[model samples]
Target: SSLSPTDACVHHIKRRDIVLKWELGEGAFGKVFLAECHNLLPDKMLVAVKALKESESARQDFQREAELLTMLQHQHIVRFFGVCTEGRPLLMVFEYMRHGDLNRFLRSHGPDAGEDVAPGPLGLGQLLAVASQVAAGMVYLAGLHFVHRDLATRNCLVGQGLVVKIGDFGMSRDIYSTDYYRVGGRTMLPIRWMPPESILYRKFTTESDVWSFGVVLWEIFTYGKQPWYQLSNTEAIDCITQGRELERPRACPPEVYAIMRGCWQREPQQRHSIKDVHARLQALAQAPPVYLDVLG
Candidate 1:
């Protein structure tokens, strides 16, 4: 099947027309770059270009990623420009997020700092805004029967104005290595964020994504602290299968934590759907500081 889209501006962009400016980082797919896009306009737009590492396996993975990217379109999902499979190193264009992933961004400014730039409400508002956007996007995905197999703060990207979009690219694993448990000393799984069903049966569902969103809420509220800060993957296995979830982030509102709690029920059926979670976030987004002013 031809991997082409009907979008006029991005129709089969030739590789030669692109100019890769700098390497952002490398991930499971390949190297991503900040590039100048041409021919879409004489506009010379700036974008993130993910170049494929052609080997035995990654070639197919890259194509599959392109197709998946094409199918998904929403304000909260990272924008897909197009692909340049006409040349040696295949390329997929995406919207560049200058501030990088949510995890890194949260670690830098955090909850305590950055009041000088914007007041406390703005900080928590931005974080909640990010959460609502992810929840909204999750609702969209659930409607389509899609499950983001790996959903976490690390997989979400931040743009200017605290705009957060879910980007599913695996880079920067070492920094957050503790978050992903090495399964059989091979590939890793985000065990700390996973539910008992996902951890034990290896079943990924929309409900599992709901479970991760709970942890994502904790990550943002705690200003990027590692989940289960005192525990290990082995301990997480014991803790989670035993029906334990994370503690409320210090100073996080009972209201917000209640929403997080709703997503972590041991039974998948008991867990909140993204729609329910998104709806609750929507209500909280408009309500005053009394409920959301969890920052300290």
Candidate 2:
């Protein structure tokens, strides 16, 4: 039988050519590795390969991830190379990020002191640059009617030169249903980053994504600090339900904080779109250094 269109586009790279150097990370789907694609045009081309264990659930997740990546194409988003599905552990290849996950990078390299101090490993300009890139990527996904339910600093990958890209689609859902994917029982969620609607109604939408992005911005300004760190999970849920907003990071400029606040509006319709968020961030990026100070 002839190959299907999806099969044709999803190249079957030889596993031998891609040597796994180290494990990058793991999630509900599988483990990702820092690898080298030796057979490519450029010698020792670095790549990321996600290895999924052979199982029914794993196969479904892999197919969904592959389906999403095969269609999504944007510079600020992670680039998908291909896949190696001939073996027991399914391998999905992608562009390797030199800095790895954004959350871990910031946790290790950001300021050690309180938010009022200067960023330890990066300046305010570099931080905003990454934020701008991530917002742009979210705009791209929103335009495609895709909802990244797992959008968070941890889900974003940091590449060369502090470039940020929105990756990870294990919890993503298409905008076909009536604005939600209700989960029964105790399915784990990035609760801290979720909006009230999602937490209460089990709804997931681009608007809810905006809420998560707001938390992501908070993560960046706080140098990857955990949101609602002072509160327990139940307490945090109560805090949000009570309409209490997260306090602005001391180092975060008023303008940037305003953007984050706009994303956290209680009503989903009141929230800003990804395009609006991207535009605001882009404009802020071009402003004078004084106004862009999230690191001092």
Candidate 3:
């Protein structure tokens, strides 16, 4: 059993107050919509509403997820407002991200704008801002002994001013419960982003999340290109076990690539902790702008 509804620190909003505006996105868990809270203000308050399927299992997961999200408060972590439980489909409300998910945002707009010319897309500085902010968010979660098993660009959201917030806690687990969460037999995994240990043993840890973050870095550099490119899922897993590494995206800074390497260490113990990664990324962000000359 996980946390109960009574254990959650968040409030519950009446479903009647929410007015679904339009569809945002949909995933395995549920459909997300842009919504407004008619009761929240003299001014209409906008929110991202994730409508979970009506099921006993979804109800239980919603309780657990709400409990976990209530404990998180950071500039780079999405803000959870409350839940709507008085309806057929339960809803979770969060601050709306106008720019949407990081992966899609990066793809729609080329991440690297031409140097000294015009801003055709986001510049290197903005890209680093995204990376640094996400690392900061992960550091906060690590401090709380939280393991975000899905730590990819697609799971992150972008707010105004290129602000990046780590979201999608569907796969997150607390370390105190167990250092790792073993996957059920034959459960599908995001192989390209998984570390060798996680793939082989079906275990997830903060270190495993660190490995996924490295793949996310690769994604950021490639402007949301599919990881492992043409490789099938099975082939990607095999390649990782063979001690092969993902090729550096064209023009990726060597310093940044080194951080990725440190994260992908075969032994989890040898990998950099989220704190260390955050510090290194902050330092990189502060260095002379010339170091960020590479195209995103």
The estimated TM-scores of all candidates read 0.88, 0.85, 0.85
Deviation from native of the Cα of residue 87 in model 3, angstroms = 2.6
TM-score of candidate 3 against the unseen true structure: 0.85
Candidate-wise lDDT, in order:
0.77, 0.75, 0.75
Residue pairs with backbone atoms closer than 3 Å in model 2 (clashes):
118-296
In candidate 1, what are the lDDT values of residues 1-296, reduced to their tens digit? 11122133443678877899998888664787899888775467888887776685777776676676787889888888778878678788888887888888777766455422364433656667778988887787777778776678888898877778888455746547777777676677778888898878977787888998898888888877888889877987899899887888774778889999999899899997889898888787776877555423
Q: For residues 76-154, could you state the per-residue lDDT of candidate 3 as single tens digits? A: 9999888888866888889898787787777876744232223566556666677888899888887777777667787
Q: What number of clashing residue pairs does each candidate have, in the order they appear?
A: 0, 1, 0
Candidate 2: tens digits of C-alpha lDDT, residues 135-236: 999888888877876777777888776778987523222211111223466345567888999778978888988898898899888888878889877888
Best by TM-score: 1
What CA root-mean-square deviation does each model show from the true structure? 4.1, 6.5, 5.9
lDDT of candidate model 2 versus the reference: 0.75
Give the lowest summed-lDDT range of ten residues in model 3. Answer: 171-180
User: Model 2 clash tally?
Assistant: 1
Where is model 2 poorest over a 10-residue stretch in terms of lDDT? 171-180
Q: By TM-score, is 1 or 2 better?
A: 1
lDDT of 2 at 25: 69
Candidate 2, residue 80: the lDDT equals: 83
